[PDB]
Amino acid sequence: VGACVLCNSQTSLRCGACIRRPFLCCKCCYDHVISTSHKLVLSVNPYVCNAPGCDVTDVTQLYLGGMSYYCKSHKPPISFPLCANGQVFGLYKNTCVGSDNVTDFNAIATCDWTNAGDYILANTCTERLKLFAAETLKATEETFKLSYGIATVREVLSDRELHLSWEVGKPRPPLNRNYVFTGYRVTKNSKVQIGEYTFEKGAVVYRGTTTYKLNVGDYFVLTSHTVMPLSAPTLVPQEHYVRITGLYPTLNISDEFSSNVANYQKVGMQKYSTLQGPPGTGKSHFAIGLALYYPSARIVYTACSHAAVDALCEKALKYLPIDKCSRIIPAVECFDKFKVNSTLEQYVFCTVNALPETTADIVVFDEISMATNYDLSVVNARLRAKHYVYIGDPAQLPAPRTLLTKGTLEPEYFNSVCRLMKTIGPDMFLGTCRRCPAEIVDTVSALVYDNKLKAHKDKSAQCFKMFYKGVITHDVSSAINRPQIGVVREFLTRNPAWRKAVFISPYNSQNAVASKILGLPTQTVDSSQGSEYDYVIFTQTTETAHSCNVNRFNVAITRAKVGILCIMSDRDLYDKLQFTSLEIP
Amino acid sequence: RDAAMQRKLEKMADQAMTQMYKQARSEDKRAKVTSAMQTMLFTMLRKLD
Amino acid sequence: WDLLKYDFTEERLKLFDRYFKYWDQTYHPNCVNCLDDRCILHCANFNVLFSTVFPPTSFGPLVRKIFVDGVPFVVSTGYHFRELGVVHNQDVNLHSSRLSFKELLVYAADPAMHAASGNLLLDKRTTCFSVAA
Ligand SMILES: [Zn+2]
Ligand SMILES: [Zn+2]
Ligand SMILES: [Zn+2]
Ligand SMILES: [Zn+2]
User: How far is the C-alpha of A141 from the C-alpha of C37, rounded, in Å?
Assistant: First the structure.
């Protein structure tokens, strides 16, 4: 029993062909089943013919025979069809509104999430339909994870390097950081979890959370989890106030957080606020000055990944009292300097999936770009706050979309908060970049910040760009550009100091080859987000949409604090770069 | 003919409605007692010392 | 006697050897191994006799610790009848995962958990052995 996701009318009908089994009113269920291939409908009892050895499950081909559902073949003389009169027979038939258009629901329910239009519709439909679309997309991703074959340790070459035998008849998932596996050991009549692992091509080099002496028999599977159903909206209704509501500012503040003080007051002006912080602008500084500006307020700091929550905890250790901070860890090594699992603490640092059902004065959700509507909705469901502070950057990386193959996802379609801060603009903005040199700041501000981001540092004269296509070779799930790595080698020989730089590439295979040949530390642009280095050497390695993405390029080029070398294969981004052009040797 | 075909149908439809209603009610009570029993066991175990 | 000793089979055979040495019919210390109902009665009689020897605190449910979802429980897995001897469960599950409705129903019925959680009782109003409150 439930409420029609399209009508909110109390209903006992669920669609059996939809993976999330959403609740639908009689009229909505009728229109959906007659407009798609979805013919299985669930009630308190499923709408299926109960005849012995009969397979008729279509709702339009079933009748109420006596006390059961029967097909036309097996029905008694006294029967009336399940699907008739423009409605579906079921509970609360009199109370039913229906919908003029079921196109959005039909598209969301029947889409395979392989087109950018599906995500656009998900981010632009009704709020209940947004929740349903997030549920469907996450469940589809979880199921698609099960489609991958099992990789078993066939022989151990050495430590940190393995040999894998893959399951026959099933595809092999890409071996990168986005696909974190889990090891499993063989026992008598059961199976035991031995750690979470990631794999790369060597033979496979494996990086595990915990070290082991694993041998033949252990096999690695991408762990999937149950998708709980969403109830709260991705965003609470917007309320604007005339006075600081529920907060009491401190009368003494330091110069470290003075510049944000006005923005802090804006936190009290509205139910929720959106913050756009470019790289190196002090998003953590703002988030912790919010607490220092309202010392009595109980604040919950949340982020999708453990890394961002750990960074928030690191900042809190720097400015906030340790006894007022508690890190919530569910039953991966994370921050372990706060007291563990203390819900009632004034400052509560926790990831999205491990949050407790609680209230707070302020809920600060960091790194909004990585978030999905699922995370936003579940955060609103578990946390009750007078004020919400969404912190991130639409110009940075979103959550990866494995099922998306056709089309590219724009920043406005990353999530509801992303939609707001891309359409109506962020509630407040961090306009000073303290990390990157002037060239990089100007480049990113002209690219994705509408020439608003300003440079704290001067020009470092160490920002260089080179236009070099090279040769692109493709392996199972990545791309390699050896001539670009050779150009980097020549640059390193002519500029030995740049050997302190960190190589960054959008492809894991290019990173592996660069680590093997150059000796530099290597980072994917996806994993480089949130970090910073003095010198950065970046090779585009392709001209595909993945490497030419403006958010990805911004993240890649904002990792440098002093100097950056850019080997560009795309002419558009190379010309966009405000760097000193270099000639190919 | 076509009226004795109908006025005898709302009776069986109404009783089917009532039946699956009480079946849903009983099923909900089933979940309720499941939750109560499990929480009672987990509360009584915590005293084990 | 040791409090934790529950199987007194050897003492039962010793007593039968001592006092009824030349009684032709065979004797089964635990009534599980009987051949049919008549042998059940015939062994139960001698067990009724011999059960007046052993301490009263060795008769009743036999508890064992079993973890479910990593949670240590205390559940009944066997019984020590005065007349039938020792009977062990055959489908005891150790280190199980989830408790269905039947499993919760059973584990909420037997006095194992209720007794193991309660406090010790001593009542002077009666003579029958008392367990707890
Ligand atoms: Zn459907
Ligand atoms: Zn409806
Ligand atoms: Zn049939
Ligand atoms: Zn016998």
Answer: 61
Residue C38 CA to ligand 4 center (angstroms) comes to 8
For residues A276 and A423, membership in a common domain is answered with yes
Breaks (C-N over 2.5 A) in chain A follow: 202, 331
N residues, chain A: 585
A337: containing domain = 255-429
Q: Say how far apart CA A176 and CA A201 lie, in whole Å.
A: 9
Å between A67 CA and nearest CA of chain B: 6
CA A132 to centroid of ligand 1, rounded, Å: 12
What does residue A96 show for φ and ψ, rounded to 5 degrees?
-160, 130
Q: What is the DSSP string of C8-38?
A: -HHHHHHHHHHH-TT--S---SSGGG-SSHH
Resolution for this experimental structure (Å): 4.0
The answer to whether residues A139 and A19 touch, using CB atoms and an 8 Å cutoff, is yes
Say whether both A288 and A316 belong to one domain.
yes
Instruction: Please give the structure tokens belonging to residue A499.
Output: 């050997």
Contacts of A12 in chain B (CB under 8 A): 24
Q: What is the CATH number of the domain that holds A391?
A: 3.40.50.300
Both A260 and A381 in a single domain? yes
Contact A1 B8 (CB under 8 A): no
Beta strands at A432-433 and A463-467: parallel, antiparallel or unpaired:
unpaired
Write the DSSP symbol of residue A174: P
Same structural domain, A336 and A265: yes
Co-location of A465 and A372 in the same domain = no
Phi-psi sector, A113: left (phi>0), alpha (psi -120 to 50), beta? left
Residue C79 CA to ligand 2 center (angstroms) comes to 58
Minimal Cβ distance to C104: which of B38, B44, B47 = B38
Examine the domain organization and report whether A447 and A422 are in the same domain.
no
Same domain as A387, residue A363: yes
The residue of A80, A85, A88 whose CB has the most chain B CBs within 10 angstroms, and thus the best one to mutate to test that interface, is: A80
Among partner residues C71, C104, C116, which is closest to B37 by beta-carbon distance? Answer: C104
Burial class (CB in 10 A: 0-12, 13-18, 19+), A196: middle
Same domain, A403 and A458: no
